[PDB]
Every structure is written in structure tokens, then in C-alpha cells.
Design a protein around this ligand. Structure first.
Ligand SMILES: [Zn+2]
Ligand SMILES: [Zn+2]
Ligand SMILES: [Zn+2]
Ligand SMILES: [Zn+2]
Lengths: 222, 222, 222, 222
């Protein structure tokens, strides 16, 4: 197709200019160097993670999937984390959610989308859990709200995995973070508190949901 | 942590900048136009997909796992595939691997790493499959060849999932591609041919493997 | 190895006997006629499904896992469901839990058991949902009780899967069940009501838990 | 429903008979006797493992799935295997396939069976692998030979898993076995040699495929 032509045109034009102006980017990239972070994000990738963070030299290890899940028994994501932590010694894992998320809106409104429906039932579980709180917000905001709550519930799932409990138990330098951003200004919010140990997991969980499930039904980013 | 603090600073520096400078970017985000391409890429993410393609405008729906696999029965990938095609109506799927892939190395070398070993045994299957051709080149170049063979096998698997089969059986326009690059130039190389139907799958498969498993045992991208 | 030699001798003696005695047992099985029930039970298999149902001539198509789960994204269990319904068009799917379940006990007390822990965090979700009722419950009966809720929760998961919804939509004949039992009498107990379409899914779920989370705080099978 | 009514009555009569007859059955199960064998068999359950082996007294720990898989990254089977070895401490894990397997034939037949085709794509990779030997075989006997071949393959996967590899490494005596049987007789047959450590793994794999891929293209169970 001509668009596939166009993509290789863009690559060719890019490769040429970077190898000319900043060859150092490529030669240091071709080194083995460990990334420093693990970024669990949505497949939507609305603002790419490098853009949001300013990390332009292969420093993120990245996992993506729909609505940025750390499902208890998804071996794909679980393997990402274990390879990240145990092998590449990342000392930071980041679950990032975002507003205007296709999956999160499906988890609430329950549309017939095919096979993807099953995956979103995990997020629907959390919808159902927090449904009294949700049903008090303008219907235009309820999805974005559950995207915040979705992040927090996934940081808790990641913290409770065997991959994190072992790493913590052996005394390894790992900590976990929830972020969210909105589509107005693409600026990250930090949800909850530092979580660098097993003992601080339950507190983060609470604090993040204390922050999110605020008494005044206000979204954090808009 | 100061390193995390740097990310939030970077993020504010960046955000408020794009506002002053090109505030329509976020205005452009709002509309929420469907992505045209599903990119299935490595968690390594050496050079990010946006950079390699020039797609900085939301054209990309993105999934990543260790060693960019389409494992037959991975409901993580399969779902992103199903959603991007059936729902978002993407008309292209790209499996992109890259040279210098650690997951691929470990699959050849078979060292003990913990959990990740199970995930990689899938690529170790492709190692054992093509090992006669592989062992015939210098040991330093074997994992880059399996990074290529990997792309060709994972693409054939994508073509063979019920998701792609069912899309093509109903006449929806969707196609699939294997890309690969070396880290020294970040230049894309296409694997095989055009696959816009179930008819094309066996054809794309053997011709990619023709270019890859070439008479001269040459690496495509360095 | 003695105990392994032992199984070839039990088998050997068994085969010949029912071969001589009911050759019609086998020539019927030979005709791989469609099974009539799919049975999803625990790996524990405390009493066999054949003995609980008295059905000994291939009638049950059978899936087993630790604590008899229907996990939204479990493609092992979904694929058995789907093949049994779409290909073997079974009419009854049954989820059978049991008192004194190792996996269930671990999902309450939270021992550090290895990879299996990731699996039971799904069971731990349900514990945490009804932790108020379970704490008021006597400590020594906590496990068997949650095993009851667990049936009802998995049954709900079953009906909600893309498999049960599609067939119930296209009006295929099929229904779902929650059975539980104790190991003092092996007497199948019913958890729920009839559910042969999408319409009654909600009542079934709502009646099982009311019977399970009974004010009497009593077990239903001892 | 009439047939459902029947199972509860079958259940009741059975419970009646055993208690008022041989109450030592319940007395013994009510205690904590850990099973010694993991049987990984097929959902078809053409002849129950309990009958096949003569182990009617809780000795068996059972997983089943379609065409009895040990998929590298199936966390269902892997969660049952890890629990069985690490927590219940079984000394024998058995993979048992069978002649006349609906999953295995449909791997070759490649019909449009739904979700199951993805789970079945694993089987078919052995059909493609071994097809040359298989096509020298009669067009009736290919599926039964592949059935044998798959046991040989899934057994390989099992031995290769981190779970069996970390068990063998820490000084545990656990061993693996591959059985098949035909339906004429339910007569079990061994495929390979004793695999009770890591070094033994490749030989057993090779011996089974030697005994299975024999030069006279003959079946083993009829
Ligand atoms: Zn999203
Ligand atoms: Zn890689
Ligand atoms: Zn159990
Ligand atoms: Zn079978």
C-alpha cells in the first residue's frame, strides 16, 4: 500500500538525518545498556511514554495492552515485570492510565465488542466494586474517574504478585508507581504514596483511593 | 525519589511548552480518531515506534511484550489484535523486532533467569527449528538472525489466529507485515510480501523465510 | 519404579475384565458420540465427577484447575467451554466446588506458596469482597464457606464470558450450574436457580449468594 | 431439568450405598492424604484416569485441557503443576493422550471451530513439524500417531518448564512420564524412559520419538 511506502519513507528520512546529526544516539543505543524504568501503559498510547517523560535514549522498558492491566494471571505482563526486575534490574515500575480510554468506557457501558469483552470483565469487576461512587458523577466523567481507580487497582495487583513479593523479600531495590494523565494538557498525576516494600502496599492502595475516591466527586486531572 | 521527580519536571517542562507552542496538539488528541496501524513490538523498545515511523499523530495502536511475539494462546496480545481490527478497524498489522534483542539471545543461550524462561521457550522452539541454518554462521550473528526468523514466525502466527482469519473471511480490509531493524541505523527492512488475505499467508511465510534464510547466511540489517 | 509398574498392572487387570464383561462399554466409547455435560471441577478431584453423577460412559467432558476457576482471561478454561458448547454442543455446564480445598484455604490465610499464589489472588479477590461475612464466620469453617461463594462467583463469570453470551444470543440450547459438596457425604448441593439465557443470569447470581451469605452463618454441606 | 434431576438422584443413591456400606471411604478422604501423581489428561476423558490406573483412593491430582496440552505459557496448567510439585509434593507427573481425540484430528482437519483453533494451533505446529512421517501413514491413522507424537511433545514441555527445572535443581525426586492408550481396550502404553532429573530429559524425548516415529510407520495401541 502507499501508506506502507510512506512509513518507510519517513524511516529512511529519519535514519539519514539522525545518523548525520546525532550519530552518538545510535552508537550508545547499540550498547547493551539496561533501561531504568518499566512503564505499564495502555495500547492506546495516546501520548507516547518517551514524550510524557523526556526519556529519549531507550531508558523505558515498555509493556502495553488494553486499559493497562496487571491481571493476576496474565503471563505476558507478568513475564515483562520479572524480566524487567530480576534480569534488567529496573528499580522502578510505572502503571500509567489515561483519560479517554476505549477499554475503560467499554467496561462500564458493556457494549458487544467481541473477544475483547472477556479482558474488560476484569475492569468491569472494578466498575462493579466502585459503582455507588461512580453513579454519583456526571456520566461524562465516570469513565475518566474509573481510569484513575483502574490505575490504583493495578498497582495493587502488581504489588501483590509473586514477582514483586519475591523481589521485595530478597531485599531488592524495587518500587511501584501509579500515574494518570488527561487529554487536555497531558500532565501526569501521581496517585498514592511511595511503595518500596511489602509493608507499604496496603497503605499506598488506601491513599491512592483516598486521593481518587474524593468526597467531592472531582476528577484529578480535569 | 529524585529520578522519579525528574520525570514530573520533564513532564511539566514538556506539557506547558506544547501548550505555549502548539496547543492544537491536545485539541487534536480530543477528536480521538482511530489509529490506522497496530504495532506489536518489543518491551526493549530501543527506538520507539513513533520515531521509526514518523507517526506522531495517533496513527499507532501499540502492543509490546518481551521479544515481540504473537503466542497462539496469549489473550493479552490476541485481545489487542482483536480490538484494533474488529473495533478500531485498523487496516494494517506490523510485527516489529530488532537486532540486539536480549530475550532472543537468552532463548539461544538458555541461561536460567526465573519466570521469563517459560515465555522464551516459545522462541527457543524457533531456535531449535532453524538451528542447522543458524549454527552455520558466526555465533555473534545468530541472535540477530533469530530476531529476523522470529519476526517471520510471529507474523505467520498472527495470520493464523482466528482473529485475522475471521477478519479476512468476512472481507474486511486488513493486512499484516514483518518489519526488522538494526540498532546502528534504525532503518526498517520488510520481511516477505503483501498479505491482505488468507490466500497470501503461506506465500508471505516462505518468501520472508527465503530472504531471511538466504544462501549466503547474511544478516539483513548490518 | 514400583508404584509406576503398579499402575500398568492395575490397568492391565482392569482392561481385560471389563473387556471380557462389557465389550459394549468400549465399542460405544469408540463411537466418540457427543458428551452431554462439561464439568469444571477442582484439580483435587476429592470424589470423581463420574461417581458424584454416576455417569461412567463418556457423558462428561471435563476441565480441572486449582479451586475450580472460570477466570475471564483464562484461555485454557474458555477454550474448553467454547469447544464443548460450539463443537460438542453440550447442554449443561456445571461448576462444582468442594469443602476442604487447599487452594481456597490459601486464598484466605495467604501463605507464600510459589507460582500458584498468582492463581489464587483471583480467589483472594472474592475473599476480600466478602471479608466482613467471613470474619464474623467461625475461623475453622472460613475456607469451606468461601469455597461456596467461589462457585457462585465463577458461575457468574461463566455466563458473562463471550462464549455463554453468544450462544445464549444466537439461541443455542445450553445452560449453566453451581454445584458444591462436602467430603463427609459427597451429597451435591445446588447453588442457584435455572439459567438458560442471558435474561436470568442476574437472578441466579443474586439467589446463590443470599443462600450462601445466609444470616445463620452456616455451611451448606456439613 | 429431567437429566439434572437424575444426577442428584444418582448422587444420593451413591452416597447412600457408600456410607451404609463402606464408611471407610469418607473417613479416609476427610483426612489430609496428599496425592502422589499428577495426571495431565484430555478434556475428552474417554476412560477416567481413576479406572485406567486403579487409583480410586485420592492418589491422583488431575489437570485436563483440550488434546491434553503442556503449553509453555499456559498459567492454568502451570499453576496446577507448580502447586502439585511444590505444595502437595507429588513424585510422578503423567501426561496421557489418547487415540480418537477430537482436538487432535481438528488440528489436521483445520475446520472453523471458533476460539479453539488458537489453542489448537499449538497441536498443528506438531502436525506441520512431523507431517512428512505422518503422510507416509494411512489417511486414517495419522491422527492417532499425532496423538502419540503430542504426548512426546507435551512431556518435553513439562520437563522444560521452570517448575520441573527448579524442582529437579533443589534435590526433589519427582519424575515425569508419557502415556497413551487406544479405545479398543483402555490399555496404557509408555512413551520413552524414566525422567527423574534434568540430564535425562533429552534422551526420553529422543526415545519416545524413536519408539513413536518408528521406520515401519506403525501405531502403538492398535
Ligand atoms: Zn486506554
Ligand atoms: Zn527485544
Ligand atoms: Zn480443591
Ligand atoms: Zn482428547
Amino acid at each position: 500500500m502507499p501508506e506502507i511506502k510512506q512509513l518507510f519513507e519517513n524511516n529512511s528520512k529519519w535514519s539519514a538525518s539522525i545518523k548525520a546529526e546525532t550519530p552518538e544516539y545510535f552508537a550508545k543505543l547499540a550498547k547493551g545498556q539496561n533501561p531504568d524504568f518499566l512503564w505499564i501503559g495502555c495500547a492506546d498510547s495516546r501520548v507516547p511514554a518517551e514524550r510524557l517523560t523526556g526519556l529519549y535514549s531507550g531508558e523505558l522498558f515498555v509493556h502495553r495492552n488494553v486499559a493497562n492491566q496487571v491481571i493476576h494471571t496474565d503471563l505476558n505482563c507478568l513475564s515483562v515485570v520479572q524480566y524487567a526486575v530480576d534480569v534488567l534490574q529496573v528499580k522502578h515500575i510505572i502503571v500509567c492510565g489515561h483519560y479517554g480510554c476505549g477499554g475503560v468506557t467499554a467496561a462500564i457501558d458493556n457494549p458487544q465488542l467481541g473477544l475483547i469483552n472477556n479482558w474488560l470483565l476484569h475492569i468491569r469487576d472494578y466498575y462493579l466494586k466502585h459503582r455507588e461512587y461512580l453513579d454519583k458523577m456526571p456520566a461524562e466523567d465516570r469513565s475518566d474517574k474509573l481510569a484513575e481507580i483502574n490505575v490504583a487497582e493495578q498497582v495493587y495487583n502488581l504489588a501483590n504478585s509473586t514477582v514483586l513479593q519475591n523481589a521485595w523479600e530478597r531485599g531488592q531495590a524495587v518500587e511501584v508507581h501509579g500515574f494518570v494523565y488527561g487529554i487536555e494538557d497531558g500532565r501526569l498525576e501521581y496517585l498514592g504514596v511511595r511503595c518500596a516494600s511489602r509493608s507499604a502496599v496496603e497503605d499506598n492502595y488506601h491513599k491512592a483511593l483516598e486521593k481518587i475516591l474524593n468526597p467531592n466527586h472531582r476528577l484529578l486531572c480535569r
